[PDB]
Design an enzyme around this catalytic site. Structure first.
Site, PDB file in Angstrom:
ATOM      1  N   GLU B  50     -36.565 -35.126  62.836  1.00 21.86           N
ATOM      2  CA  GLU B  50     -35.499 -35.346  61.561  1.00 21.86           C
ATOM      3  C   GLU B  50     -35.846 -36.469  60.865  1.00 21.86           C
ATOM      4  OE1 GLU B  50     -34.194 -33.035  59.495  1.00 21.86           O
ATOM      5  OE2 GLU B  50     -32.194 -33.794  58.819  1.00 21.86           O
ATOM      6  N   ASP B  61     -24.235 -39.851  52.744  1.00 21.67           N
ATOM      7  CA  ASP B  61     -24.294 -40.318  54.199  1.00 21.67           C
ATOM      8  C   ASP B  61     -23.224 -41.310  54.507  1.00 21.67           C
ATOM      9  OD1 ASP B  61     -26.552 -38.933  55.104  1.00 21.67           O
ATOM     10  OD2 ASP B  61     -28.003 -40.176  53.831  1.00 21.67           O
ATOM     11  N   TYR B 176     -28.869 -26.169  58.798  1.00 16.45           N
ATOM     12  CA  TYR B 176     -28.113 -27.058  59.165  1.00 16.45           C
ATOM     13  C   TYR B 176     -26.559 -26.639  58.704  1.00 16.45           C
ATOM     14  CZ  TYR B 176     -27.354 -32.183  59.684  1.00 16.45           C
ATOM     15  OH  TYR B 176     -26.809 -33.266  60.110  1.00 16.45           O
TER      16      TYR B 176
END
Ligand SMILES: [Ca+2]
Ligand SMILES: [Ca+2]
Ligand SMILES: [Ca+2]
Ligand SMILES: [Ca+2]
Lengths: 395, 260, 395, 260
Positions: B50, B61, B176
């Site tokens: 990833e 993030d 995910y």
């Protein structure tokens, strides 16, 4: 109906991570119910009028363009409570979050103007206010941090990364991702993901709505043009919104040219930017050939923003509104002029709009013209900035 | 369809093991060391990769990943530099699943398909665009099906059953999941299993081997560690030899937690 | 008619040197003609409304006295252009001097508030503005000196004597003695020699005039009391004037108690001062047993004045108005409260009036009361002062 | 009436000379030196004395006189201390005209007549209240006529002919004129002569002996020097012996300009 258009001609949208979509959908539905609830609309007006000071004056300048035939008017958003137009949409969103059942409010700020406006609204409406701020900005803004703390707000310095405004948006957004069930995020301008560009416009509408009715009662006709600076788009769409359907009124937005567009240190992506996806929206961007967003610059912090609201980019691609630039020196000289000729200290953000209006007057001084400048805010905050740039040169 | 992921997840459940997928951002801390980081990730037993491509404003993030996009950009990393690393890795490790974690503007600027083509030429198998939700993926997903790259979507535990159903159908490769271990996690997988979603993977807050073991249990095909792998890079920037050793040790102990 | 009463029950008068009498007589006659000229009255209103921002809001507080049955209203003179009530009477006097045929204006200031207000009026009305200022005050007020200079005013530091406000009045008055044929002296408050106390009242009247009509339309009855701080008397007589003939409305003025009346460091001569002759008027004075005027003290510079207007001293000796005191700490705590409970930063001058109103509410919390506080000005100027006193104690 | 001034001005025009009247504020710079200053003023040939009593806020005086009220107050001077000096001077120099330059609040506080009585007991002949104009002197002037002190009024060159006539009738002792030497000065005295004003004296800006000589010329009974005498005190504060000598020299050269 349970949906509102998120686009302005393929500008805008909702380009956020999936975790934030239910927050936006929830905020959209509550906003639609709010615009239908009449007790909400009356509480908003009593708030703007009996507390914020609306309607704001529409001043006719006496001396700054006396050497011309231009009749130049100023929409006096500097006389609003808080010293800037931000108070309008901050009172609206806070009132909106109050009837979502929420008591907490997340916000971010760079210079401190939005932070102060969020703090005073949350103080009046009894809301727990958390404002994120870059650790470097906290150091540079001691008076504005003390203002925010005096009104019961929690100032959360952000030390990670660049430790400035770009990093406070990251904290405020990720905070909202985890806590949108109890807290609302009071976005500072008319940009970002839907429905924020639409909500801010509806809570700044009364700017243009008052000017139109004030100008009809004062001069008799509609103005030839309305001019407003464009950082994110908040105060300019506030002025333009009620004039869009008046086909014979030009809409001029002024972006900052900084040290010169040819120098790269500017904040004018609307006419010098490639369209991209950033801040949860699709809009013009100051970006490099690879897609990295570039640093923007303006002498006024309020215009230092490398993107722009979606409805503005739309209004440019339809031909409805023209957008111009003003350098640091042009806004500085317009700042000094309004102090000397009129009796008003304008915000350096607003001075960009004024500097452009001074162009339209002095370039055709024998032309009968009726112009409006949206004086978005007071200039007392820029006293220290103007003094140091003047002393660094020759004053 | 049948991609490298389908080959991997079938081989893994045959051996009855979970997938450990480390996250490292490409070009961190610089181009030469980044390839060695990716190299040691595969040699140390990673089932899939990833890899993020550095962005200016990663608004989704956390701080650890933020500091890592900065390290790479401060060193001059380019999407071109990333494809060079992706190409050199697949040239060495064929049929090893490689996914990319991207922000949309890197794709939209210089052409969506034009960017998607460079990915497949570099050997990429999947792409997850962090700031493009499911209800606005149409332009990106159509091009993804034409070039042959799997489009990956995040399944947060608080989306609509309508939206959660939509992610199951649009997805490919794997799903995910932002669900935590320590609406609950099991009830999330129940809705994803009924809607024939791609095999689920857990990502949020997977740092210790304990959390990996308690992730294959309760029914997940694998687990991704974001901050935990990047943090080893952050804490050993001056020490290249210790970094790779602490890195190989991390992958081995995290992979051991995916067995049985 | 060519004369107007110079006294308020043996308070006031014209105790100036002979050289200044023709200046006062001339100013009196022009003021009488001005109040009869209707083009003057309309230009004054268009100035206050379309430029200064009048009418100002009348805000109802929501949280500061929620624990009581007191309905507490704020007259929002902080929303006026310039951030204080001074702008009202400064625009009037400057407009008055413009039709005396004069182009020059003499003024003095201590903190800088009056100086800034005189500068912005002279900038708009194209008047040459000279402001006198103590050399020590010039050093302590860098932002306000730069404001005054930005608007074209000549800042004249006074180094002689104490080199503070007492010495700038001497220069400004002696300047007016020599130059009253070409220049007018814009007195800062409702004190001094006739006709200054009467002129300032008529140019601050619209404060109380707006409240009365605003309160009738909002609550329905006249308020039980109006509360305003009293430094020289400007903003308090502005509020009281139109309420004097309403027999059932109490008039409460609040003087500064400083560090405590028992400590001698105060500014409350109205209830702790011997009547004397000073500043060209007969009025209560902080004086010693020999006749020397004593130094006054307040935490806010606007209230640091060892005398008071004549009409106030008269209103006390007739029983029409009551006058109270508020210490530094009471105004400080009222300052901090209005920031936290409401969303307003008040001037430390205005906080003395507010602190007294908070007394009337908390002392009888079950009593139905309708009170007005004249929020005479914004508090952004006192940010630095409040922060240093809080840090000197514990903040 | 017939006061010490009438005796002086008749003796002076008999000798055909003008009057030089120095101004010094009492108690400047301190009580002991102030008496010696007043003492040397009389010994050096002053015809009359013009003495101020220190006030806190002398809003009518210039900087030189301002610094002199401050010097005296900083040293602790009291109206009591001033009467002690006035009493000790008249005890030594009988029938020497002494006028006081006062601010009103020193008179009004502690009683107008009560203060006026202390003046006459100290031997004072006249009182000029700087901040009480002619149209508002009624309370002060009535008491002045009852105790027997002459009330002096300033005649500025730009007052009404009505006001200028009023000052001529209310006046006594002499008339203080603000007219300068270098409406003109002659036309001022013309109106004062027609209205039987008391004998005129010039005060404003009389510093050099030139200005005194050109003051008795053009028709004035005398001349007062305010700042010029006080300034000698200001420039010699540390040097007591030089101060008195520069002071005696000043009075002699200024008095010589009043002859012929
Ligand atoms: Ca910037
Ligand atoms: Ca031209
Ligand atoms: Ca003081
Ligand atoms: Ca009680």
């Amino acid at each position: 109906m349970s949906k509102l258009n998120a686009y302005f001609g393929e500008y805008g949208g909702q380009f956020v991570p999936q975790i934030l979509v239910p927050a936006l959908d929830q905020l959209e539905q509550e906003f639609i119910k709010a615009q239908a609830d009449e007790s909400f609309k009356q509480e908003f007006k009593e708030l703007l009028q009996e507390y914020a000071g609306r309607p704001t004056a529409l001043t006719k300048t006496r001396n700054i363009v006396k050497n011309t035939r231009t009749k130049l008017y100023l929409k006096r958003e500097d006389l609003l409570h808080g010293g800037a137009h931000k108070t309008n949409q901050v009172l609206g969103q806070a009132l909106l979050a109050k009837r979502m059942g929420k008591k907490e409010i997340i916000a971010e700020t760079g210079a401190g103007q939005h932070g102060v406006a969020t703090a005073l609204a949350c103080a009046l409406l009894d809301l727990k206010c958390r404002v994120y701020m870059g650790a470097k900005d906290v150091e540079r803004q001691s008076p504005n941090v003390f203002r925010m703390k005096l009104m019961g707000a929690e100032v959360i310095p952000v030390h990670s990364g660049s430790a400035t405004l770009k990093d406070a948006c990251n904290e405020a957004l990720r905070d909202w991702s985890a806590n949108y069930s109890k807290a609302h995020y009071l976005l500072g301008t008319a940009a970002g993901p839907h429905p924020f560009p639409t909500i801010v416009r509806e809570f700044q509408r009364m700017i243009g709505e008052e000017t139109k009715q004030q100008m009809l009662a004062k001069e008799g006709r509609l103005p030839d043009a309305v001019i407003a600076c464009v950082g994110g788009g908040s105060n300019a769409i506030g002025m333009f919104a009620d004039f869009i359907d008046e086909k014979n009124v030009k809409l001029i937005g002024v972006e900052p040219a900084g040290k010169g567009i040819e120098t790269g240190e500017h904040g004018a992506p609307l006419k010098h930017g490639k369209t991209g996806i950033f801040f949860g929206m699709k809009a013009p961007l100051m970006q490099n050939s690879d897609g990295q967003i570039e640093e923007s610059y303006s002498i006024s912090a309020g215009l230092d923003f490398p993107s722009v609201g979606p409805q503005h980019a739309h209004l440019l691609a339809i031909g409805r509104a023209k957008y111009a630039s003003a350098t640091d020196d042009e806004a500085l000289d317009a700042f000094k002029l309004l102090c000397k000729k009129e009796g008003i200290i304008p915000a350096l953000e607003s001075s960009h709009a004024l500097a452009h209006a001074l162009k339209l007057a002095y370039e055709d001084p024998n032309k009968e013209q009726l112009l409006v400048v949206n004086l978005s805010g007071r200039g007392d905050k820029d006293i220290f900035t103007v003094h140091d740039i003047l002393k660094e040169k020759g004053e | 369809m049948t991609n490298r992921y389908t080959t991997l997840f079938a081989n893994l459940e045959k051996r009855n093991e979970g997938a450990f997928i480390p996250f490292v951002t490409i070009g961190d801390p610089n181009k030469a060391l980044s390839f060695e980081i990716i190299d040691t990730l595969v040699s140390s037993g990673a089932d899939a990769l990833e890899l993020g491509i550095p962005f200016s404003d990663p608004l989704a993030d956390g701080p650890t990943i933020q500091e890592a996009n900065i390290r790479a950009l401060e060193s001059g990393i380019t999407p071109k530099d990333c494809f060079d690393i992706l190409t050199k890795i697949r040239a060495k490790y064929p049929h090893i699943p490689i996914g990319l974690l991207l922000y949309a503007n890197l794709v939209y600027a210089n052409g969506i398909e034009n960017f998607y083509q460079k990915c497949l030429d570099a050997g990429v198998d999947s792409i997850l665009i962090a700031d493009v939700p499911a209800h606005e993926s149409k332009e990106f997903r159509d091009i993804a099906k034409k070039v042959g790259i799997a489009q990956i979507f995040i399944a947060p535990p608080d989306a609509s059953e309508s939206t959660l159903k939509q992610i199951s159908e649009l997805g490919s490769g794997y799903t995910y999941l932002l669900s935590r271990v320590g609406m609950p996690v099991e009830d999330v997988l129940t809705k994803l299993r009924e809607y024939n979603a791609p095999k689920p993977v857990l990502g949020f807050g997977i740092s210790k081997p304990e959390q990996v073991q308690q992730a294959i249990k309760a029914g997940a095909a694998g687990a991704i560690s974001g901050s935990a792998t990047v943090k080893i890079i952050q804490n050993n920037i001056s020490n290249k030899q210790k970094m790779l050793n602490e890195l190989t040790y991390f992958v081995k102990e995290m992979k051991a937690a995916t067995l049985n």
